[model samples]
Structures are given as structure tokens and as C-alpha cells.
Target: NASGSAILNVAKSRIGKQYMSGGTGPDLFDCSGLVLYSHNQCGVYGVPRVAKDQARGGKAGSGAAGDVVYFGNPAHHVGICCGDGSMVHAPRPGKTVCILKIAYMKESYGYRRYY
Candidate 1:
């Protein structure tokens, strides 16, 4: 569970950072960038760089804390689950990394748990 905890920790540390498409940085991040960078920081690598590919990468099931949750059929957005019906995601431009209710965002296409 170390990686899972670390993943959440890393994502949480990024809360309030601005969102930028194609960003995978110490500041701004896109949805997939946040997910991939967070996981990589936790020693979980090889994650796809795009939302659609990531949505289809791992085990399909309801996400637990630190799991990956994606929206749209092929997933236009992705985030880390908080296991409290909320998730940490880097929303679109003009937004910042924040935690929001899963339902409040949009209908989830599915969940992906890496490991």
C-alpha cells in the first residue's frame, strides 16, 4: 500500500496548481499528466500518457483510494480516487488541481486500478 498512499500524497501535494494541456510538471498538469506523474512519483511507471489509453490500461472495476477513475467512453479525463466518492484531478484549462465529487464532474465511463 505504500505506493498507493504515496500516489495520493503526491497528488494532494499538487492541489491548487494550474492545469495545462500536455503538462507533466512540478506545477501545472493536465488530467492524464497528474495521474501519470503522480504514479511515477510513487514508483508506478509505464502508465499511458493519454487519457483514453490510460482508461483502458489497468484492471476494470470500481476504484478504491488511489485508484484511477476515468470519464467519457474512451476517457477524456482521468483522476485519482479518494475512495470517498471524490477524486483528485487536474481539470481543464482555467481550473486547478482539486478534489470534486465523481458524480459532480461527469458520468464515469469506468474505473482503472493499476496494481
Candidate 2:
């Protein structure tokens, strides 16, 4: 459970940063950037750099803590589960990193948990 807790903690720590098109940083982050950065820093692993790209390694409906959730039609975005039915995502440009309901973002292609 340490890994799960660690992952959520890392994501929670980045609650208010701005979002950029291709940002992967402490200030700005895009969808995949936040997931990749959180996993790399909190877990010592690397996830795919693109949202739909992670589809290769993830399974659907594992929408629990530490899971990777893909959003938008055709899966245009990604985020990490924060363990409360909410996920921490960069969302889109001009927005900051924040937690939102995992079910209402847009369209749910599937879920991916990198365990």
C-alpha cells in the first residue's frame, strides 16, 4: 500500500500548477506529463509520455488509487487517481493542476493502472 499512498501523495502535492501544451514540470504540466512525472518522482518508474500511448500497458476499470485514467474522445488526456473518486490532472492550457471527478471529465476510453 506504500506505493499507492506514495503515488497519491505525490499527485496531491501538485494541486495548483498551471497546465501547458507539452509541459512536464513542477510548474506546468500536460496530461501525460503529470502522470509520468508523478510516477517517476514518487515510484521510481516511467510511464508513457503520451496519454493514449499508455493504453498499451493499462487495463480498463481499475479505477482505484494510483490508477491512470484516460479522458476525452479517442483518449486525448490522462491523469493519476487521487484515491477519492477524483484524479489529479493538468486538464488543459490556462488551467492549473487540480482534482476532479473521474467520471465526468469527458469521455472515458478506459483506465490504466501501472502496478
Candidate 3:
């Protein structure tokens, strides 16, 4: 199994990339795109493409490192848990991919694991 360390390593490499709504790339990325890209890069595949789908599709997990944490009731946003109470995510428009305190996010819909 690809460990959380493997998945996190991929996301960490893209820490400062810009957030593009539909990006799934070697550069810019959206929240779910980052997850999908990071997973795919780690040789893990079949992850869902959108935030909500991803929030609902993966195996349920405690919000541990490398888990995909989601926010909002219907899950409008997502990020990768860093195991330090922070996460790496694309945030919103104009903001670049970065780490944020998990407490700073609103609406905790828990998390999902894909490894």
C-alpha cells in the first residue's frame, strides 16, 4: 500500500503552485485536482475528480496524515491532512496552494483515505 508519507510527499512538492479551478497538473491545481494528481503521482489511481465526489467516495478515515479532509456540509472544499493539524490545499481563487490550520477551516465533514 502507498503510505500517507508517499501521498504527502507528492503534495508537498507542489506547495506553492497557483490554484486554477480545473487544473490537474505539473503546475496549477484545484483542491481535488491536487489530491487526484498527488495520488496518481504516487501510483494510486481511481480517485474521484471533484471535491464532493472525493469526499464521499474514498474509504472513511480519521483525519490522519495524508487523509483527504473535507469542509462544508455538501463538501465544497478539500485538502490533504499534514498530521500536524494543518493541511495543504489550493484554497480559493487568487490564493496559491498552501498549508492552513485545520481549525481555520469551516464545516468539518471529516475525512477520507485512499491508500
lDDT of 2 by residue, 3-92 (tens): 766777787788899888888887789888888888888754757788878655645537778788787555688888876788888888
Which regions of candidate 3 deviate over 4 angstroms? none
lDDT of 2: 0.77
Residue pairs clashing in model 1 are none
lDDT of 1 by residue, 1-115 (tens): 6666678788899999999999986898999999998988888877899999999897774667778889997678899988778889998999999998889875755788775
Model 3 steric clash pairs: none
Candidate 1 vs. true structure, TM-score:
0.93
TM-score of model 2 vs. true structure? 0.87
- Residue 92, model 1: lDDT of 93
The Cα local distance difference test for each model comes to: 0.86, 0.77, 0.86
User: Residue 113 CA error for candidate 3 (Å)?
Assistant: 0.4
RMSD of 3: 1.3
Off by over 4 Å in 2: 58-61
Candidate order by decreasing TM-score? 3, 1, 2
